[PDB]
Amino acid sequence: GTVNWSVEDIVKGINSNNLESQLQATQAARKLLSREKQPPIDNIIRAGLIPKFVSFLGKTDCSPIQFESAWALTNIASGTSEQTKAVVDGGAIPAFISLLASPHAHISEQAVWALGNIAGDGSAFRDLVIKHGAIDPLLALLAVPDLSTLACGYLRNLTWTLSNLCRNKNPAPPLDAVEQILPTLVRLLHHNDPEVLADSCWAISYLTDGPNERIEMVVKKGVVPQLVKLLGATELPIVTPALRAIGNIVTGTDEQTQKVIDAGALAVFPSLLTNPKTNIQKEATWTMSNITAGRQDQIQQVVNHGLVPFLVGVLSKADFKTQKEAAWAITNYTSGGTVEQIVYLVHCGIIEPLMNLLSAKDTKIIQVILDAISNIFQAAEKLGETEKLSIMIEECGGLDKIEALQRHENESVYKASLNLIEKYFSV
């Protein structure tokens, strides 16, 4: 019927002055643009159909051609920034915003999707969609007593569009826009659908990836507790965006980081630091390094939750990048920790793994390791046990590693390397 139409035939039918013939050609185009592979987006654009599709968006009398052109334009806008730009250049943004108020829910949902594709292109298209006034109508669609009264697909699409309105930086979404959507995003973050929960966590992760003022707007909304609950989830698609948002919040103030700790976050890291997904281990280890850069009571919280042996494990065996984050966590712990905490680290077995990572090619990981070694040695001086730490480093072979670091390409590496060798390994 309308399958496998030539763009020429689609152009012939759309250029008819027969609304029904245009609907047939607009549906044939949607099918071409909805096929499994190689949607001829460029061919559709060059035929000059985007303007016709945007004009069809306004056919209140022909809701079919409104839905057909919505889908075609959605899939065009799904492509490169060039093709999205073509859709936006056709005056599609205001037309889709108008369709958001359609009584046909599939037409409304298609407009939601199209706006999601536009806004997801980048920060400029995101702010342009916002300026055209899409937040009010989009949030009006979710103004129900129970979101469970909404179609699973409808809800998922609205959440994914809202996540795209909270995504992208340079600049971050307008503060007013984030404050107008944050309340509805918190309700979707408490929804029961795994896809709505992951997209909501990804929206919250986008909002928390910026200055401490942004982190505060989200933390003030009181989402950290549900984020920690979603951090425990069995779905990696939900645990991934949850850990990122928690990590983003622990990049902020020590009070924002203490809000995470109070919510029970540290109790999930035993699993996140042993998680089979390398990306989860890395991000958890980077959240731990930012937690050990905090106050001493916060380091003591880390210690009380048994997380130091887990950092030792990660430093002993884990993806190099995870190990680099772990070396950072150790250097932060030892820079800000009490002498009692620093000694707890060496009792947990941090010396051998740390000294074994000194044989790494990365120069920055060696500088970070040498930094922690010096901080622990400084704590050892306070106890008069530096000799025992020197004996521990010489036994694990790390003394040889430092000795060789004295000929390293970097100045700081051999500079700090020679200092410790002529400070705790000299007569």
Binding site: R35, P39, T74, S78, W113, G120, W160
Partner: peptide
């Protein structure tokens, strides 16, 4: 990550 844009069907 990779869902910035979505194509229907």
């Amino acid at each position: 990550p990779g869902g910035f844009k979505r194509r229907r069907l």
